[PDB]
Amino acid sequence: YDIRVRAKKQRCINSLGINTNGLIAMGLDRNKHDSSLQIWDMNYHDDSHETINPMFSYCTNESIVSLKFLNDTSVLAASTKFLKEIDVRSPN
Amino acid sequence: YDIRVRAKKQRCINSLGINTNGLIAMGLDRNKHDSSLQIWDMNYHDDSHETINPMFSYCTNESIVSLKFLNDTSVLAASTKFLKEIDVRSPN
Secondary structure, eight states: OOOOOBOSSOOOEEEEEEOTTSEEEEEEOOOTTSEEEEEEESTTSOTTOSBOOOSEEEEETOOEEEEEEOSSSEEEEEESSOEEEEETTOOO | OOOOOBOSSOOOEEEEEEOTTSEEEEEEOOOTTSEEEEEEESTTSOTTOSBOOOSEEEEETOOOOEEEEOSSSEEEEEOSSOEEEEETTOOO
């Protein structure tokens, strides 16, 4: 098919990752009212809206520049001043 | 394997549903501070805790007695005084 999606607050996309189980992550620019690491699944996405409702939101007030899915649950994300490995099963 | 799970507020389980894509729903009794229709996935479940973190929470202050997964996203739930079809892609 063909679907176009975007964040709730529109800004430039730096990185992108698709997991093995279809989980999709996204690296955005820095916005003070939104998360720059949005992880969501396309099967549970409302098709009537361009915006995405993320399952997991991380890295608020940060600018993620590169990311890569390590496992089926863990993602390795790089910001402009940090390097993190964030698991979706823990908020820390 | 073998895993035991329960709600954040422990109460009797009335119904249970497993979807085709591995999504698991659950019908509980009536609690005034918790949702009786907890839908969650076991792959994104923290294995160090007995409690479940639900992806979608519905039917607060209600007692769901029977439920059945219609589609990969919609569930048909029955309470003690209502009969609802709740889609996970919309909060209404």
